[PDB]
């Protein structure tokens, strides 16, 4: 499963947000590894929008237009147990709940991060 609970990350416009998603695999989890990150924007009604994906040993991005080029996995070895990603140059539009799904049949886990972006620094 994923090593961290549902959390809230508060950043400032322009900064970069690090969305942690580390996981441990069980001996039973013998199926192929899939890592999907979805987002439910606060500004609109869309829910569970695909942001980035790791399937069949390949990375697939370019799903959520407004987030183009600003999302990348942080680790250079996902299989090792780290699905974390970075959202660079945060904008107020990036606010919403980001979800990390890590699957290895029969294994499945997910984590929800509520990202908040503030015009200028301070959560004081």
């Amino acid at each position: 499963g994923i090593t961290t609970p549902e959390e809230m990350i508060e950043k400032a416009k322009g900064e970069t947000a690090y969305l942690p998603c580390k996981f441990t695999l069980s001996p039973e989890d013998q199926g192929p590894l899939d890592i999907e990150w979805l987002i439910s924007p606060a500004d609109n009604q869309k829910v569970d929008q695909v942001i980035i994906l790791y399937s069949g040993d390949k990375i697939y991005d370019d799903y959520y237009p407004d987030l183009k080029g600003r999302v990348h996995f942080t680790s250079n070895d996902l299989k090792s147990g780290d699905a974390s990603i970075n959202v660079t140059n945060l904008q107020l539009s990036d606010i919403g709940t980001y979800q990390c799904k890590v699957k290895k049949a029969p294994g499945v886990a997910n984590k929800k991060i509520h990202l908040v972006v503030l015009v200028k620094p301070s959560g004081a």
């Binding site: 039973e28 199926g31 695909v50 994906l53 697939y60 799903y63 799904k101 049949a105 029969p106 499945v108």
Partner: protein, 185 residues
């Protein structure tokens, strides 16, 4: 048993698992449950990338096929929609069991009832009216063909959502659609 031998699904919340027009551009959620000689099925399809997010003006139909071998085991190659790494098998929790399906013919459409060369026959079809987006102002039809895109000793399920012609700049998305068929075994 850790898994349910009466259910074959893609898991409730699959990741883009089809490359219909372009790589991993769609999510196909499919669940099949065996109730004696009848399989109760619920299918749902939604575009997540490319033209499937913006139905082209000329598009009139969007469809997918699932082709199985003589043991009822899915074949992950054209024209099967689900990609090779996609989850498909017995249900185990919110995921899929890694066991191989050994009672596959219990989920396959009966070939005596739906002969391989009979896909054009009304009987090899279950057609219903439904709605794009689930929006009752956007009616569409769903046709499920049994064993029409077969092999020999093989089986198949085909899903065609038609009447899309007059729906533009809309992502392709269906409601959970029900269907059923007589089983091979």
């Amino acid at each position: 048993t850790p898994y349910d031998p009466l259910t074959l699904w893609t898991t409730p919340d699959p990741s883009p698992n089809c490359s219909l027009i372009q790589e991993l551009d769609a999510k196909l959620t499919l669940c099949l449950t065996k109730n004696g000689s009848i399989v109760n099925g619920i299918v749902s399809l939604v575009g997540v990338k490319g033209n499937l997010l913006n139905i082209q003006s000329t598009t009139t139909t969007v469809g997918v096929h699932l082709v199985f071998d003589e043991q009822g085991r899915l074949i992950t190659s054209t024209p099967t929609a689900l990609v090779p790494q996609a989850s498909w098998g017995y249900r185990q929790g919110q995921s899929v069991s890694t066991n191989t399906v050994t009672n596959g013919l219990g989920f396959m459409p009966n070939v005596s009832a739906y002969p391989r060369p009979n896909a054009s026959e009304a009987k090899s079809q279950m057609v219903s009216l439904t709605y794009l987006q689930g929006d009752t102002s956007k009616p569409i039809t769903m046709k499920v063909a049994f064993n029409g895109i077969t092999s020999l000793n093989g089986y198949s399920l085909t899903f065609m959502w038609s009447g899309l012609s007059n729906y533009i700049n809309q992502p392709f998305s269906t409601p959970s659609c029900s269907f059923s068929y007589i089983t091979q075994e």
